[PDB]
Enzyme design. Structure first.
Site, PDB file in Angstrom:
ATOM      1  N   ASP B   7       0.932  -1.090   0.001  1.00 53.48           N
ATOM      2  CA  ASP B   7      -0.045   0.043   0.106  1.00 53.48           C
ATOM      3  C   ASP B   7       0.818   1.268  -0.114  1.00 53.48           C
ATOM      4  O   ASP B   7       1.986   1.136  -0.014  1.00 53.48           O
ATOM      5  CB  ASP B   7      -0.717  -0.026   1.318  1.00 53.48           C
ATOM      6  N   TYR B  39      -0.242   9.255  -3.470  1.00 54.68           N
ATOM      7  CA  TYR B  39      -0.371   8.632  -4.632  1.00 54.68           C
ATOM      8  C   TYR B  39      -1.492   9.233  -5.450  1.00 54.68           C
ATOM      9  O   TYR B  39      -1.548   9.213  -6.672  1.00 54.68           O
ATOM     10  CB  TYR B  39      -0.402   7.159  -4.363  1.00 54.68           C
ATOM     11  N   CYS B  70      -4.571  -0.742  -2.060  1.00 53.38           N
ATOM     12  CA  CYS B  70      -4.608   0.808  -2.679  1.00 53.38           C
ATOM     13  C   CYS B  70      -5.443   0.754  -3.664  1.00 53.38           C
ATOM     14  O   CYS B  70      -5.568  -0.025  -4.766  1.00 53.38           O
ATOM     15  CB  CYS B  70      -3.305   1.255  -2.938  1.00 53.38           C
ATOM     16  N   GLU B 147      -7.139  23.673   7.111  1.00 53.04           N
ATOM     17  CA  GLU B 147      -7.009  22.698   8.445  1.00 53.04           C
ATOM     18  C   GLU B 147      -8.478  22.363   8.556  1.00 53.04           C
ATOM     19  O   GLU B 147      -9.367  23.020   8.263  1.00 53.04           O
ATOM     20  CB  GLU B 147      -6.725  23.550   9.711  1.00 53.04           C
ATOM     21  N   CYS B 178     -12.707   5.988  -0.494  1.00 51.14           N
ATOM     22  CA  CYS B 178     -11.625   6.283   0.305  1.00 51.14           C
ATOM     23  C   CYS B 178     -12.103   7.681   1.123  1.00 51.14           C
ATOM     24  O   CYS B 178     -12.212   8.558   0.497  1.00 51.14           O
ATOM     25  CB  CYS B 178     -10.418   6.781  -0.473  1.00 51.14           C
ATOM     26  N   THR B 179     -12.069   7.354   2.372  1.00 48.67           N
ATOM     27  CA  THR B 179     -12.713   8.229   3.217  1.00 48.67           C
ATOM     28  C   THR B 179     -11.903   9.330   3.963  1.00 48.67           C
ATOM     29  O   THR B 179     -10.901   9.283   4.824  1.00 48.67           O
ATOM     30  CB  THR B 179     -13.449   7.760   4.505  1.00 48.67           C
TER      31      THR B 179
END
EC number: 5.1.1.3
Lengths: 252, 252
Positions: B7, B39, B70, B147, B178-179
Site C-alpha cells: 500500500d 499517490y 490501494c 485545516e 476512500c474516506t
C-alpha cells in the site's frame, strides 16, 4: 484605510470575516499562498522568505497594515516583516496569548499548534513571561500517510488522550494553535472537558482596534498564488457567498 | 504460503489484520510506500511505475501472491503487475464490487473514491457490467489548503450534502472508496441515512480464500520506504501492539 491579510491557505478568511464585521468600512485585500500551502513544515528561513514575498505583494497593493493570520509565519517572520515593510504588522500569536493570560484562572494553559510554530517557542515564551505554565504539544500530521477515515471511532479517542495526555486535567485555558483531524475542537473539548478555548481570530481582529481607522470604500479583494482545486468552493462556504478571486500576479 | 500486501501508507494494515485473523498461519510481508505517499494525484503511468517497484520488492522478498490494498494502484496497475510478476495479484476494487452488487437490492449504488481512481472508471465500469446504476463522486482534498478544524460544525454538514447530493436518496449501497474529512463514515451514513457500506477490507480478505493455502511460520514483517513521523505510533494503534518496522532497502 486598506487592510491586507495574508495566509497560506483559507484558514485566514476567518479573521478576515471578523475584521470586516467589526471594521465595516475598511477596504481589504487578502492573499493566500496556496501554491506553497504546506507551510508548517518548511524552515524558519523559508517561512520568513515566503512571508516577506506575500507581505511585499500586499504592500505593493497599497495597504496600510498587514495582518498575518498564520501561526507559523507569525512565529518566525514578524521581526523581518516589520523591518522590511514600512507599515504596521500584526500576527495571531500575541493576541492569543494576551487573551489566554486573561481568560485563565490558574495560569496553567496549553497550546496545540503546528510542529513548526511549536518548535519556534514563541507561544511558550510569551505565555511564561506573562506568568503561566505552558503545556504545548504539536499537531499530528496524519492525512499524508493514512486517510482520516482510518482515525474514526476507537482509534480517534485514543489519539487524543495520548496527545492531550499531560494537558489531562492540569489546564483550564487552551489556544487552539492549529486544529487537525482527529484533534478537532469537539474531540478535544470532550476529552479535556469544557475548557476555555481561545478564539485566536476574534482575539486578533479585536487587537487591531487602535491602529485601524474604520474608513474606506468597503471593498474586498481576494488573491491566491494557485487557483487550487476546491478553493473557490471553500470561499463560498466560509464567507457566505461567492467572491471572485484573482491569481497572484495576474492582471496585477 | 507468504502473502505480500502493499500500500502507499498504513491504510493497508487493515486488510492485513483481516487476512492474518482469517489466515492464521500464513506468513506476511507488508510494504508501505510512505516516501511517495500522496499517490492518488499522480498519473496513471506513475501509479503503475510505483506499483511495479513495490510489487517487485515483495516478489524479491519471496512472496506467493501480492495483495494491493490501494484503490488507485488497483485501478491502474493490476494488468501490468500480473504481466510482470509471475504470481497471483489481487486488488481491492473487484471484491468491493462483487459485494456491492450482492448487498444491493435496487442496484443503484455509489462510490466515493480518490480523484485518480474515480477518474480511472474501473469502479463505474465493473458495477455497470454487473447491472447497476453507479453514482460516483471524488474525495475532497482539503487538508493542504485549510485545516480540517475549519470544516467542523455548520460548514461540514454542508460539504457533505453538496457532495453526496446526487446520491441523496437514490442509493442503498456504497463502496467507501476512500474516506477523508469531513466525509467520514459517520458524517455520510448520517446524511444518507443507514445505508449498507461495503467493507472493502473484509471483502478483499475473504476473496483470497481459494488462492491462499493457510500454511506457514505465522510470521509478520513490516516495511516502508520512509520512516515517516508518527508511522510507528499509527502501527501501534491499528495492529494493537508495536511491530518493529524496517526501511525498504535497509539490511534488505
Amino acid at each position: 484605510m486598506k487592510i491586507g491579510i495574508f495566509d497560506s491557505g483559507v484558514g485566514g478568511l476567518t479573521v478576515l470575516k471578523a475584521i470586516r464585521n467589526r471594521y465595516r468600512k475598511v477596504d481589504i485585500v487578502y492573499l493566500g499562498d496556496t501554491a506553497r500551502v504546506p507551510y508548517g513544515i518548511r524552515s524558519k528561513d523559508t517561512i520568513i522568505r515566503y512571508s516577506l514575498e506575500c507581505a511585499g505583494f500586499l504592500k505593493d497593493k497599497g495597504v496600510d497594515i498587514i495582518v498575518v493570520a498564520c501561526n507559523t509565519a507569525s512565529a518566525y517572520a514578524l521581526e523581518r516583516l516589520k523591518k522590511e515593510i514600512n507599515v504596521p504588522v500584526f500576527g495571531v500569536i500575541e493576541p492569543g496569548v494576551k487573551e489566554a493570560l486573561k481568560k485563565s484562572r490558574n495560569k496553567k494553559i496549553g497550546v496545540i499548534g503546528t510542529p513548526a510554530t511549536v518548535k519556534s517557542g514563541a507561544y511558550q515564551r510569551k505565555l511564561e513571561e506573562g506568568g503561566a505554565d505552558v503545556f504545548a504539544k504539536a499537531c499530528p500530521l496524519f492525512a499524508p500517510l493514512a486517510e482520516e477515515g482510518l482515525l474514526e471511532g476507537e482509534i480517534t479517542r485514543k489519539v487524543v488522550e495520548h496527545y492531550l495526555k499531560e494537558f489531562k486535567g492540569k489546564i483550564d485555558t487552551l489556544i487552539l494553535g492549529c486544529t487537525h483531524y482527529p484533534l478537532l475542537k469537539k474531540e478535544i473539548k470532550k476529552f479535556l472537558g469544557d475548557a476555555e478555548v481561545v478564539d485566536s481570530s476574534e482575539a486578533l481582529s479585536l487587537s487591531l482596534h487602535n491602529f485601524i481607522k474604520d474608513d474606506g470604500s468597503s471593498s474586498l479583494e481576494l488573491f491566491f498564488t494557485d487557483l487550487s482545486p476546491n478553493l473557490q468552493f471553500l470561499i463560498k462556504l466560509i464567507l457566505g457567498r461567492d467572491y471572485p478571486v484573482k491569481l497572484a500576479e495576474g492582471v496585477f
